[PDB]
Amino acid sequence: VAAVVVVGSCMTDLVSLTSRLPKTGETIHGHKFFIGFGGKGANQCVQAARLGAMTSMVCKVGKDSFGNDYIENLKQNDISTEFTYQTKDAATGTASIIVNNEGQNIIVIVAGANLLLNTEDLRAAANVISRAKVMVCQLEITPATSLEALTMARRSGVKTLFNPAPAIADLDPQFYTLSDVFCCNESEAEILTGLTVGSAADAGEAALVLLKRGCQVVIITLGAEGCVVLSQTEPEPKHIPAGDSFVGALAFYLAYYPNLSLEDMLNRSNFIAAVSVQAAGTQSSYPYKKDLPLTLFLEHHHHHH
Amino acid sequence: WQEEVAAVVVVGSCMTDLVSLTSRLPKTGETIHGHKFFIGFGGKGANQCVQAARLGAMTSMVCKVGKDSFGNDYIENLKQNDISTEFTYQTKDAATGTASIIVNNEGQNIIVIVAGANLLLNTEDLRAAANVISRAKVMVCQLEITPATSLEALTMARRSGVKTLFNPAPAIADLDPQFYTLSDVFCCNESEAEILTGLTVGSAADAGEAALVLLKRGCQVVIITLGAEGCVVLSQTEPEPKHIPTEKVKAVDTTGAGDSFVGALAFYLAYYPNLSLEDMLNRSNFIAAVSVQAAGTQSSYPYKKDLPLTLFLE
Ligand SMILES: [Cl-]
Ligand code: NA
Ligand code: NA
C-alpha cells in the first residue's frame, strides 16, 4: 500500500557532446550521445524508493517508446506505475542538451505529456492519494494540477511536502496554506519573495515571509552549505550547516520516521544528497539503503554516532 | 515458390531523429522551452531505402543499429515499409545513431549527429551479404558509415557487375579517388559539389562546371541536385550539361527531400533500366517534390498507389 505518492513530472534527458556548438543551419558531428532519466517528480520518487519507501508515481508520459522506457525505469526502481498515464496527445517530456569541449551548453526543454496531467487523472488515483502518508508535488506540471493534488491530500489528512520548483512570481496564495512542509532553494525563494538571497541570514528573512503567507514549515536549501528552517511553532530561523535527492529523502523520513526531529531528518537528508553529488550521473547516482550507513535508518537512542 | 529477390541493396546508415520545435534557436549557454518534440526514423541510407520500397522496389537494408529501444524500433520501421532486415545488424557494443535537431519557426535548424552503431558496420557484416549483393540490380552507398565500409560495398557491387549509385553525403574534401572510379551514378547537391571540387556553386551553370571535374575523376554519370530547382546531369557519352528544371512552389517541409530523390532514382535504375536518364530524373524530381508538401521526413515519402500513373509507364 504506497506510503509516499508523488504527483509530478517525468522527463528524458538526451545529451550529445560535440567539439563546437553548431551555428544556424549547421550539422556538426558529435562524439558521444547518452540518455538519462529525469524530471523532479520522478527523481524525488526514485530517491524515496531506493531508501525503502513504498511509492507511487502519478504522472503522464507519452504512448511512445520513451514513455514505455520510462515506465520500465519506474518499475525497475520498485515504484508503482498504476497511475502512470500514457497519452497519444503529446510526447513524453524531453530535455535535449548539447555540450561543447569548453563545457558550454544549449538546452531545449519540451515538457510534453507532463502538462496534460489533469484533474480527472488525479481523481482516478484517489485511492492511492487518500491512503498515503505523504504527498509530494513540484511545479513542472500544470500548477492547477499540483494545487488540486495538495487539496486532495489535505482532505484525507495526508502530509503535504511541496517543492515550488521551478519557481514563479505570482504563485496562488492557496499553495502556502496547503503545504505542511514547503521546501525550496535560494533562487527559488528570491522569485517567490522578490527579495535577494545570498547569505543564510537573507534566507532566514525570506523564509519568514513565506512562513507568514501560511506555510507550517519552511525550509530554504543553501546548496552544499546545508539549509535554514522555520516553523509556525518555532519562527526563529535555525541554520543546519542533488535538490531532488534531498526532497526525496525528506519524503521518506516524513513517512517512515515521524519520531525524528526536523533537525535530524534534515541532517540525514543532507547526508544522502551529498552521497548523490559524489557519484557520476543523475538518477543513477541516487544511493540505495543497503549502500548507506545503517545509522540513517535507526532511532537516535539505538546508535553511538 | 521463390522469394522475391532484392533488386535494390542499400549499404548505409539508420539514425533516430530527435527533433524539438522552438520559437528561436538558443544562443550559447541558453535554456529555452520548445513547443513540441517529435521522434522520427532517419539516416540517409534508410531514407533512400524507404523511398525506393514505397515505390514498389524489393529492397534489403544492410546497416547496424543498437540492441537498444531505438534499434528495436528501427527494425520494426523497416519491416513496416516491407524492407528486408536480414542484414540489419544489432550490436550491444554501441547505441543506435542519433540526430539531435532543433528547428525554429522559420524552418532554420541546428543538428548534432552521433554516428553510434553505424560506425561498427564492418567487413564481416558485408561478407555475409554476398549472395544478396550478387543478385541485386543496384547498390546504394552514402558517407554516413565508415568510409572503408562504403568503399568495400562499392567494390563488392562492381566485382559482381551490380550498378553503383553513390551519394557522397555528407561530403569531405579529399575523398579517396576510388570513390569516383567505383561510381556508375554519382549524385550530390550544390554544397557537396563545392566541398568536393573546391569550386563555388550557386547557379545551374556553376553546377555544370563542377560536374565536369567530377566526371573527369572517373564517374560514369554525375548528377548535381539544385534543391527544389531540379538538377543537372552529365555522362561519359554525353559530357554536355543538361539542366532538368522544376516549377517554383512553397514548401511545407523539405527535410529529407534529397534522400527521396536518390531513393526514387535507385528504384528507376533497378526497375526501369531502359528509361533515358533525362526521364528518370524527371520522375525522381517529381517524387521529391511530393515529399516536400508533407512533414516528417520518411513519413512524407509518397507511395506508388498515391502517385500519378505516368510515373510507372515505360
Ligand atoms: Cl571478399
Ligand atoms: Na550525482
Ligand atoms: Na517533407
Curated annotation (Swiss-Prot), chain B:
Key words, A-Z: ATP-binding, Carbohydrate metabolism, Cytoplasm, Kinase, Magnesium, Metal-binding, Nucleotide-binding, Nucleus, Potassium, Transferase
Record InterPro entries: Carboh/pur_kinase_PfkB_CS, PfkB_dom, Ribo/fructo_kinase, Ribokinase, Ribokinase-like
Activity regulation as described: Activated by a monovalent cation that binds near, but not in, the active site. The most likely occupant of the site in vivo is potassium. Ion binding induces a conformational change that may alter substrate affinity. Competitively inhibited by phosphonoacetic acid, etidronate, 2-carboxethylphosphonic acid, N-(phosphonomethyl)glycine, N-(phosphonomethyl)iminodiacetic acid and clodronate.
Residues annotated to bind ATP: 189, 225-230, 246, 258-259, 285
Database matches in SUPFAM superfamilies: Ribokinase-like (SSF53613)
Record's keyword annotation contains Amino-acid biosynthesis: no
Any one GO MF annotation of this record: metal ion binding
PROSITE patterns assigned: PFKB_KINASES_2
A single cellular component GO annotation: cytosol
Cofactor comment text: Requires a divalent cation, most likely magnesium in vivo, as an electrophilic catalyst to aid phosphoryl group transfer. It is the chelate of the metal and the nucleotide that is the actual substrate.
Record flagged with keyword Nucleus: yes
EC number: 2.7.1.15
Gene3D superfamilies for this protein: 3.40.1190.20
Catalytic residues identified in the record: 259
BP GO annotations: D-ribose catabolic process; pentose-phosphate shunt
Domain of life of the organism encoding this protein: Eukaryota
Reaction it catalyzes: D-ribose + ATP = D-ribose 5-phosphate + ADP + H(+)
Residue numbers binding K(+): 253, 255, 291, 294, 296, 300
The protein's required cofactors: Mg(2+)
Metabolic or biological pathway, per its Swiss-Prot or TrEMBL entry: Carbohydrate metabolism; D-ribose degradation; D-ribose 5-phosphate from beta-D-ribopyranose: step 2/2
Top-level EC class as recorded in UniProt: transferase
Compartments (UniProt record): Cytoplasm; Nucleus
PANTHER family reported for this sequence: RIBOKINASE, SUGAR KINASE
Function: Catalyzes the phosphorylation of ribose at O-5 in a reaction requiring ATP and magnesium. The resulting D-ribose-5-phosphate can then be used either for sythesis of nucleotides, histidine, and tryptophan, or as a component of the pentose phosphate pathway.
Family: Belongs to the carbohydrate kinase PfkB family. Ribokinase subfamily.
Entry protein name: Ribokinase
Originating organism: Homo sapiens (Human)
